[PDB]
Design a protein around this ligand. Structure first.
Ligand SMILES: CCOc1ccc(-c2nnc([C@H]3C[C@H](NC(=O)c4ccc5ncccc5n4)C3)n2-c2ccccc2F)nc1
Ligand SMILES: [Zn+2]
Length: 204
């Protein structure tokens, strides 16, 4: 793998920018923290810029194609991604071939504009078994990782609660509190720009 991490200084505005987006986009969930745990804030341990030429070229190339298919606009968004496969993703890239076939929006790659949403998917679907060490979805000890990714949404189909994008579309926007999820069915419509290492913070 030709993938490379840049540790960002916490005084670095680029860090603070992602730091802020992460903290500010937290919300009260339907769950009551059953999936991602109980917290109002994160402990932000490490933000690393992911650098990989093969993956950057794969993305921009697709981004161009999509623009041409969508009135010369990529419809590019910074979105959080949670999943068990973050360590794989930063090396091999996002890969649709590992999508969960029984998602509410079919076999795609789910993003969110709310850190606290993506957080839910970190230890699997609906938080899964929780952390590997304590089997606790609300673990304040075990360090978690999210991705803050450049995502090419293109022309996004609006759905509510499938295998590819609907015809003439590049992404799906859902809203099942209604919060926004986003789905792609092609790994190269997303680049994982920042690797965020963090804990959820116990409130009091
Ligand atoms: C309420 C149900 O809601 C959701 C929300 C999000 C997702 C989701 N979104 N993305 C994923 C992951 C599959 C995709 N995986 C990769 O890009 C990838 C890339 C390289 C890999 N290499 C080795 C092994 C696995 C690898 N996986 C990201 N997943 C995902 C897929 C399978 C299991 C868990 C997941 F979160 N699925 C369902
Ligand atoms: Zn734990």
């Amino acid at each position: 793998s030709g993938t490379i991490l840049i540790d960002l200084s916490p005084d670095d505005k680029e860090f603070q920018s992602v730091e802020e987006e992460m903290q500010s986009t937290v919300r009260e969930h339907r769950d009551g923290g059953h999936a991602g745990g109980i917290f109002n804030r994160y402990n932000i341990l490490k933000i690393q810029k992911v650098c990989n030429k093969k993956l950057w070229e794969r993305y921009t190339h697709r981004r161009k194609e999509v623009s041409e298919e969508n009135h010369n606009h990529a419809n590019e968004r910074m979105l959080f991604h949670g999943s068990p496969f973050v360590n794989a993703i930063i090396h091999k890239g996002f890969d649709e071939r590992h999508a969960y076939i029984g998602g509410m929006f079919g076999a795609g790659i789910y993003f969110a504009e709310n850190s606290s949403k993506s957080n839910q998917y970190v230890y699997g679907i609906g938080g899964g078994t929780g952390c590997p060490v304590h089997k606790d979805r609300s673990c304040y000890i075990c360090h978690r990782q999210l991705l803050f990714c450049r995502v090419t949404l293109g022309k996004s189909f609006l759905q509510f609660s499938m295998a590819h994008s609907p015809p003439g579309h590049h992404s799906v926007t859902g809203r099942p509190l209604a919060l926004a999820e986003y789905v792609i069915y092609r790994g190269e419509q997303a680049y994982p720009e920042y690797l965020i290492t963090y804990q959820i913070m116990r409130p009091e």
